[PDB]
C-alpha cells in the first residue's frame, strides 16, 4: 500500500573540532 | 506497504574542546 | 507501510573556543 511516514531523525553529528591556539 | 522516506538528518554535534594554550 | 529508516548523522559541531592565553 502507501509508503510509511518518514523515518526518525538520524544520529547526532560528531563533536566539533578543537578551537585554535589561545592568544599569545 | 513499503518503508517510508529516510528521516531527517540528526542534530548537530556538540561544540569542540578549547584549543591548546597560546604560543609564547 | 512502516516508518522510514533513520535519517543520516547530523552535521559536525561547531569549532571549540580559542585555548588559554599562552606564556609571556
Numbering used by the authors:
A (entry chain B), B (entry chain C), C (entry chain A): 25 to 47, 50
Which text from the study accompanies this structure?
In this study, in order to gain structural insights into an NH–π interaction between Gln and Phe and better understand its chemical properties, we solved a crystal structure of a collagen-like peptides (GPO)3GPQGFO(GPO)3, abbreviated as GPQGFO, and characterized the side chain interactions using several lines of evidence including circular dichroism, quantum chemical analysis, molecular dynamics simulation, and structural bioinformatics. The GPQGFO peptide crystallizes with the triple helical structure characteristic of collagen molecules with 1.385 Å resolution. Two axial pairs and one lateral were observed in the structure depending on the relative positions of the interacting amino acids. Two axial pairs were, respectively, composed of Gln in the leading and Phe in the middle chains of the triple helices, the other was between the middle and trailing chains. The conformations were located at the region with dNM ~3.3 Å, θ ~10° and ω ~150°, well within the empirical cutoffs for NH–π interactions (dNM < 4.3 Å, −25° < θ < 25°, and ω > 120°) extracted from the previous data-mining of protein structures. The side chains were pointed in opposite directions (dNM = 7.4 Å), which did not form any interactions. In the GPQGFO structure, Gln and Phe, with Cα atoms separated by 7.7 Å, made a strong NH–π interaction.
Each chain adopts a well-extended PPII conformation with successive Gly-X-Y triplets. Chain trimerization is induced by inter-chain backbone hydrogen bonding between Gly and non-Gly residues.
